[PDB]
Design a protein around this ligand. Structure first.
Ligand SMILES: [Ca+2]
Ligand SMILES: [Ca+2]
Length: 47
RNA sequence: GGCCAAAGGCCCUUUUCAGGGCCACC
């Protein structure tokens, strides 16, 4: 599990953006940047 | 434990069903 406050807060932000839409990746997980970015993309559609 | 999803490493953006950058892999 991830603990770095910069990674957590950015991940939380991508999520916030998501559950702010009209219409889910675990932020506490160990993942490369491309990996987490990939899941958020897919998840954002749709959602 | 592993079985699937995502995934080169890292970074920026509400163009966010998306756009962009560094580095590496000739
Ligand atoms: Ca795959
Ligand atoms: Ca990897």
């Amino acid at each position: 599990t991830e603990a770095d406050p910069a990674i957590l807060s950015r991940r939380q932000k991508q999520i916030d953006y998501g559950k702010n839409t009209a219409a889910t990746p675990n932020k506490y997980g160990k993942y490369s940047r491309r990996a987490f970015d990939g899941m958020v993309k897919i998840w954002r559609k749709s959602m």
